[PDB]
Design a protein around this nucleic acid. Structure first.
Length: 87
DNA sequence: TCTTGTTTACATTTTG
DNA sequence: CAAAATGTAAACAAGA
């Protein structure tokens, strides 16, 4: 009996795995979504923001909330913010 | 307008 | 038990 359609891991924990599966160990908001879709089965079929407002909002909430994650300036024009694990 | 972030509420579960 | 967590849902503000 899972805790979520995708199992017992939490959004914040899923995010961690994402960021922590990156070379520079840092992702922008958009990539984190894509990671979920490509790494988590329950989401493989939810990329269409047409059916993906719930888990995206949640993911944005988790990011912006828990000091576990920190926002780091990403150099570039029209680029989003880096998101890294807080040491 | 669609993205990004932040915040605030609420209902439940888990923790410590 | 009470506090920290969690998952949703939403209101608002500044960016691309």
């Amino acid at each position: 009996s899972r805790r979520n359609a995708w199992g017992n891991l939490s959004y914040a924990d899923l995010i961690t795995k994402a960021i922590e599966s990156s070379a520079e160990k840092r992702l922008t908001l958009s990539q984190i979504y894509e990671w979920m879709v490509k790494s988590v089965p329950y989401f493989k079929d939810k990329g269409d923001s047409n059916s993906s407002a719930g888990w995206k909002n949640s993911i944005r909430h988790n990011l912006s909330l828990h000091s576990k994650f920190i926002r780091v300036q990403n150099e570039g024009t029209g680029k989003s913010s880096w998101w890294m694990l807080n040491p």
